[PDB]
Amino acid sequence: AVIPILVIACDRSTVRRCLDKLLHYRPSAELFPIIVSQDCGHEETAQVIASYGSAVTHIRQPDLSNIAVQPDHRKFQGYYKIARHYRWALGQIFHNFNYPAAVVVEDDLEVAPDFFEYFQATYPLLKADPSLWCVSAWNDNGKEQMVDSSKPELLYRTDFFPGLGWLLLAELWAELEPKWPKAFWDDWMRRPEQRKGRACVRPEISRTMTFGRKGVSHGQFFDQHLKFIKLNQQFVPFTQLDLSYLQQEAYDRDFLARVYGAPQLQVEKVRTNDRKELGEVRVQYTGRDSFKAFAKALGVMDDLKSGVPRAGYRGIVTFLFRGRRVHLAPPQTWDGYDPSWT
Ligand SMILES: CC(=O)N[C@H]1[C@@H](OP(=O)(O)OP(=O)(O)OC[C@H]2O[C@@H](n3ccc(=O)[nH]c3=O)[C@H](O)[C@@H]2O)O[C@H](CO)[C@@H](O)[C@@H]1O
Ligand SMILES: [Mn+2]
Numbered sequence: 001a002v003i004p005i006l007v008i009a010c011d012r013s014t015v016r017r018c019l020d021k022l023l024h025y026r027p028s029a030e031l032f033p034i035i036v037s038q039d040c041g042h043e044e045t046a047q048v049i050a051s052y053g054s055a056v057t058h059i060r061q062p063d064l065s066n067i068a069v070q071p072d073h074r075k076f077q078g079y080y081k082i083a084r085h086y087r088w089a090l091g092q093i094f095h096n097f098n099y100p101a102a103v104v105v106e107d108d109l110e111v112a113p114d115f116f117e118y119f120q121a122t123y124p125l126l127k128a129d130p131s132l133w134c135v136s137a138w139n140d141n142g143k144e145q146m147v148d149s150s151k152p153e154l155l156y157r158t159d160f161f162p163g164l165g166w167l168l169l170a171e172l173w174a175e176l177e178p179k180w181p182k183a184f185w186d187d188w189m190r191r192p193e194q195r196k197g198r199a200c201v202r203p204e205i206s207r208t209m210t211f212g213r214k215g216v217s218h219g220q221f222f223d224q225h226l227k228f229i230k231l232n233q234q235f236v237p238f239t240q241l242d243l244s245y246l247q248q249e250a251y252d253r254d255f256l257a258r259v260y261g262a263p264q265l266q267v268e269k270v271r272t273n274d275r276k277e278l279g280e281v282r283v284q285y286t287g288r289d290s291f292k293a294f295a296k297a298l299g300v301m302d303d304l305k306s307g308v309p310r311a312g313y314r315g316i317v318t319f320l321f322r323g324r325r326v327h328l329a330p331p332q333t334w335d336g337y338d339p340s341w342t
Helices: 015-025 043-050 074-096 115-128 170-179 185-189 220-224 248-261 267-271 288-298
Strands: 005-009 034-038 057-060 101-106 109-111 132-136 155-158 166-169 199-203 208-210 280-284 317-321 324-329
Touching (some): 005 074, 015 115, 034 043, 074 101, 074 170, 074 185, 115 132, 155 248, 166 170
Parallel strands (some): 132 199
Antiparallel strands (some): 109 208
């Protein structure tokens, strides 16, 4: 099973940093061929990629024309270009190279030492559980003081598609390509019409980190959140672990029981670190206002996509807060997301 790393690039020479780390950590060239798809025609970025010679396969998006945006998107042509490139690059991977799957990595991401180990261990889970539609390296709330460094092996299921270093099966591309959007591809996949209740595996500690300060999007989201996501440094031999706990029939019984079996604690008590004998608690939210207030009070990303919170699963956001395991969760009667929660 050959799993290619598809690197998306355009006009940043710092794709160098991305490639150096991938190539440095790659355990097998044959198992993980690196295909760098470059859009934009930026000469310097092209030479940088070319300088790797046979270590990579350099392909170039063929259509550099400007894109006619809808009336509401004058300021967002960059996003149209990203979607068009993804469509072409992914089509190359699955139609031309004909690979059974691929790990998508943008040019401004640095991978952790166990990046490949992580994906070779979770690929079989993705293939065996159809309720899963991706494996992501990203923990949306993976800031340093919000993750347990003593559990770098801990993984989770999430309804919130993280992207940022993610594996998909050729089977999924078959589903998406026919209806691929003109822009904002990641938020589009977050919609239920695309997701269809499926989840991704995400880790306690991220296997990628971003340094792309300047890019298509403006730097506010990167400056206030993305730059703080910590890169895992301790190598975990995921291929030697039993990851059967991530299968739907085990996770939805065990993890949920764990969450709703945990004692409930007032958000204020958690914030000030009161009642420390409760090493694992549930902070229950009941409405949209309480969710965003409690989220903000504990330092969790508080925005919602199609009603789903960052790293949420059945509405539950799990993270570490001042050394305490916390599950910001809805009442046990939760029964599906509400896109009206914005
Ligand atoms: C951290 C985060 O959530 N980043 C997302 C953000 O991009 P973000 O705001 O991070 O913008 P970037 O500049 O990093 O561009 C994202 C990717 O698009 C490529 N690119 C850029 C310009 C262009 O004309 N052609 C092209 O192919 C870049 O090389 C890069 O690999 O929104 C994009 C969706 O719209 C997603 O793809 C990114 O994952
Ligand atoms: Mn970026």
